[PDB]
Amino acid sequence: PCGFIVTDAVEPDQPIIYVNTVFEMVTGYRAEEVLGRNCRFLQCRGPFAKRRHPLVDSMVVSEIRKCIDEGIEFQGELLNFRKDGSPLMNRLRLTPIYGDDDTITHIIGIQFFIETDIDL
Amino acid sequence: PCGFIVTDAVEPDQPIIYVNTVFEMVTGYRAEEVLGRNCRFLQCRGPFAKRRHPLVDSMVVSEIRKCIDEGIEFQGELLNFRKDGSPLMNRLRLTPIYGDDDTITHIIGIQFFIETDIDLGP
Ligand SMILES: Cc1cc2nc3c(=O)[nH]c(=O)nc-3n(C[C@H](O)[C@H](O)[C@H](O)COP(=O)(O)O)c2cc1C
Ligand SMILES: Cc1cc2nc3c(=O)[nH]c(=O)nc-3n(C[C@H](O)[C@H](O)[C@H](O)COP(=O)(O)O)c2cc1C
């Protein structure tokens, strides 16, 4: 039961073009609120948080950004938040998708969400 | 400008869970009309035909299901039809997506539509 995301890798800043119903149900963000955004909003603790939360690991975020910049897959884990602010550990897999011309047209995201017992 | 498709590889018979705008524009089918269905409907001539049309290459259709069954990529070309029944040549690439526990959870479809000489028309 994993979250599934698609970004457009040609448009700047990997805008989301699809999220599955698991993403929606687990994160509390409905598709209409998310398509056209970069996924990094999940690192903010709910919609009033304008900044990445100090508990999401900036070393993992750096590594994601590098894997995307380099056109390679990523696998790791970082803290995300539901729309209502509850914390969620996200075991994230990114997979670049090739259209034809040896170019990356899309990136697929797989999210395996893990409940966390932390007090914020 | 490719069509882009996602299916659920865990649910039975690869129901479509996403198509992009290019798919909609080129095939003439809106997302609402195709979600939850297998893509094979594009091998039928228009929305009211239930079985794959004879001019569709059954050898290629066979190789597509083989690739899906084996969980490997597919690349190839086949005849499809728009919602208005006009023929399409679809250069299709399929890519399985591995979720957790080394399992395929989804398949991605890239459609590059190319011109055919195929013409059934009046
Ligand atoms: C397909 C895809 C899925 C992503 N899914 C998530 C996610 O579920 N949670 C998250 O925190 N970041 C996710 N990201 C990462 C952010 O979009 C962004 O790449 C990351 O924060 C690094 O960039 P930045 O330093 O500019 O924020 C995803 C990225 C892509 C391309
Ligand atoms: C992700 C994905 C995208 C597909 N896209 C198309 C398509 O655009 N056109 C088409 O004729 N078949 C497409 N198919 C194939 C059909 O769904 C079906 O797998 C094919 O006809 C072989 O299976 P069948 O003999 O049971 O019909 C796609 C399949 C998958 C998994």
Number of H helices, E strands in chain B: 2, 5
Query: What residues contact B86, with CB distance under 8 A and at least 6 apart?
Result: B121
B18 contacts in chain A (CB < 8 Å): 6, 18, 20
CA-to-CA dists, residue A76 to A38, A96, A113, A115, B107, angstroms: 18, 15, 12, 16, 22
Strand order in the sheet with A104-115: A16-19, A3-8, A104-115, A87-98, A74-81
Q: What is the dihedral of CA A113, B13, A6, A115, to 10 degrees?
A: 0
Total tally of structural domains belonging to chain B: 1
Query: What residues contact A90, with CB distance under 8 A and at least 6 apart?
Result: A42, A77, A78, A79, A80, A111, A112, A113, A114
Resolution given for this structure, in angstroms? 2.1
Closest CA to A49 of A83, A94, A2: A83
How far apart, in whole angstroms, are the C-alpha atoms of residue A4 and residue B101?
16
Q: What is the dihedral of CA B46, B51, B56, B60, to 10 degrees?
A: 130
Q: Give yes or no for residue A27 CB within 6 A of ligand 1.
A: no
Question: Which two structure tokens, joined as six digits, stand for B61?
Answer: 């259709």
Phi, psi (5° rounding) for residue B53? -60, 150
How far apart, in whole angstroms, are the C-alpha atoms of residue B18 and residue A75?
24
Contact A97 B95 (CB under 8 A): yes
Give the domain range for residue A104. Answer: 1-120
Phi, psi (5° rounding) for residue A39? -60, -15
How far apart, in whole angstroms, are the C-alpha atoms of residue A59 and residue A13?
19
Q: State in Å: Cα B31 to ligand 2 middle.
A: 16
What's the half-sphere exposure (Cβ side, CA atoms, 13 Å) at B95?
Answer: 17
| Nearest Cα residue in chain A from B75 | A100
Query: What residues contact A28, with CB distance under 8 A and at least 6 apart?
Result: A82, A83, A84
CATH number, position A60: 3.30.450.20
How far apart, in whole angstroms, are the C-alpha atoms of residue B59 and residue A19?
34
**DSSP letters spanning chain A:** --EEEEEESSSTT--EEEE-HHHHHHH---HHHHTTS-GGGGGBSSTT--SB-TTS-HHHHHHHHHHHHTT--EEEEEEEE-TTS-EEEEEEEEEEEE-SSS-EEEEEEEEEEEE-----
CA-to-CA dists, residue B66 to A98, B9, B62, B121, angstroms: 21, 14, 6, 32
Q: Give yes or no for residue A38 CB within 6 A of ligand 1.
A: yes
PDB experimental method: X-ray
| Nearest Cα residue in chain B from A2 | B99
Signed CA dihedral, A35, A40, A42, A44: sign only: negative
Inter-residue contact A53 to A79 (CB < 8 Å)? yes
Task: Looking at chain B, list the stretches that DSSP marks H as alpha helix, in order from N- to C-terminal side.
Answer: 21-27, 58-70
Strand partners, A52: A44
Contact A97 B108 (CB under 8 A): yes
